[PDB]
Amino acid sequence: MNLVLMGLPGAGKGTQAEKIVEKYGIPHISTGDMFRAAIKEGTELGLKAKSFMDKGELVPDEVTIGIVRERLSKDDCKKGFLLDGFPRTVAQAEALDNILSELGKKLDYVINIEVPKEELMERLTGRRICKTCGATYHLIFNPPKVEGICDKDGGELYQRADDNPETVANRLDVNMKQTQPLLDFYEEKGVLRNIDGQQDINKVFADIKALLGGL
Ligand SMILES: Nc1ncnc2c1ncn2[C@@H]1O[C@H](COP(=O)(O)OP(=O)(O)O)[C@@H](O)[C@H]1O
Ligand SMILES: Nc1ncnc2c1ncn2[C@@H]1O[C@H](COP(=O)(O)O)[C@@H](O)[C@H]1O
Ligand SMILES: [Zn+2]
């Protein structure tokens, strides 16, 4: 089961990714998670990635492709994987095509979770994520069992530096700019499925399960 989740910041990819991996047991590969881990570790790569991430800009394709290639070479990806938030440029989708040629694999689906722009600000400003595993919550729409504490592992919940209204507006511009070229790319391959992300979390998941049951 070889999957991409795509969608604008705040659309629900992490949320759904968590549910997909619990149900099916494939690895969650999130480029955002990896970069935040790198910045927390203080790696050379993390410190270089921080400047883009703090501005809501994309990390260069070379760096991003490098981290994803390495992740995809691990044994846990041999029975499938979930890419969450990669690719985000047509160059990255082209790279992924080649990578997957080398791995003798193809994407089963690119799941595009569509949410109107106007709703994304509220999703992002109420978002809180776990320090220790990156689980995603929302203070209104999806709160933790206990305020400020992750359901899974008890980690502290925090507001991402980039989930402030100024940085969010730049993020939405930057990612929208890449969206139609990516939709067109995967529409041409015939693997793009659009999901209505303006539904109940569990309804959105129901729709994804309908796609995935076959693989
Ligand atoms: N279908 C939904 N309805 C309402 N809120 C949602 C839904 N899906 C996710 N959320 C919440 O909105 C925010 C963005 O979701 P998230 O999965 O982190 O987005 P992404 O990974 O696409 O940026 C989070 O605070 C999350 O709890
Ligand atoms: N595929 C990617 N390409 C370039 N930058 C990325 C990618 N995925 C994540 N990032 C960087 O990580 C930040 C957080 O991503 P996310 O966690 O998906 O919101 C983005 O604003 C980018 O700076
Ligand atoms: Zn956690």
Side-chain angles (χ1 to χ4, degrees):
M1 187 179 291
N2 311 144
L3 305 181
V4 168
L5 279 165
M6 69 167 285
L8 294 177
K13 305 184 296 294
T15 299
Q16 294 309 132
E18 292 165 29
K19 293 177 139 306
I20 291 162
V21 300
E22 183 160 358
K23 175 158 277 269
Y24 304 105
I26 45 157
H28 187 183
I29 302 165
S30 157
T31 33
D33 284 338
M34 294 184 292
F35 285 135
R36 283 184 291 276
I39 293 157
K40 188 55 183 137
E41 274 301 323
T43 66
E44 186 155 16
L45 174 146
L47 294 191
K48 289 195 177 75
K50 190 178 192 312
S51 59
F52 297 91
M53 295 174 76
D54 285 343
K55 295 161 127 134
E57 297 289 331
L58 300 179
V59 179
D61 287 331
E62 297 87 339
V63 169
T64 308
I65 290 156
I67 64 166
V68 170
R69 182 66 191 84
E70 181 159 6
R71 184 69 184 81
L72 280 171
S73 68
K74 301 309 207 312
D75 287 346
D76 73 325
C77 295
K78 281 160 178 174
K79 193 131 188 276
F81 51 77
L82 177 57
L83 288 159
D84 166 15
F86 174 102
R88 264 143 102 160
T89 64
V90 174
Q92 288 172 199
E94 291 180 13
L96 176 57
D97 264 10
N98 276 299
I99 289 165
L100 296 183
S101 300
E102 303 306 333
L103 308 194
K105 289 193 201 313
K106 287 208 167 187
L107 295 175
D108 302 303
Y109 292 101
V110 168
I111 294 141
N112 176 51
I113 306 174
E114 180 183 299
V115 177
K117 196 227 299 197
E118 296 70 31
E119 263 216 322
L120 298 175
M121 187 60 73
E122 74 194 293
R123 291 201 183 175
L124 290 170
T125 57
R127 177 161 72 179
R128 308 283 182 277
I129 76 162
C130 175
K131 282 183 78 156
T132 62
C133 73
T136 302
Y137 298 87
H138 193 278
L139 297 171
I140 315 304
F141 305 132
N142 193 17
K145 294 174 147 162
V146 177
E147 187 279 295
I149 297 299
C150 184
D151 295 356
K152 301 299 134 204
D153 67 351
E156 192 171 8
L157 307 187
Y158 76 97
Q159 196 174 355
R160 285 167 53 164
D162 64 347
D163 282 352
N164 68 79
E166 176 152 24
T167 307
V168 163
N170 194 50
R171 287 167 55 214
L172 295 176
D173 287 349
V174 162
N175 289 89
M176 281 158 83
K177 231 146 82 83
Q178 306 303 315
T179 296
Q180 193 59 238
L182 272 166
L183 294 180
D184 292 355
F185 177 93
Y186 288 121
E187 178 171 23
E188 196 267 356
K189 298 181 160 282
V191 292
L192 178 79
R193 295 288 177 280
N194 299 324
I195 295 292
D196 187 353
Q198 192 172 17
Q199 297 180 278
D200 172 49
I201 290 178
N202 285 308
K203 180 55 172 83
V204 174
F205 190 52
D207 294 4
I208 284 158
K209 285 188 291 191
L211 260 13
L212 305 180
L215 293 348

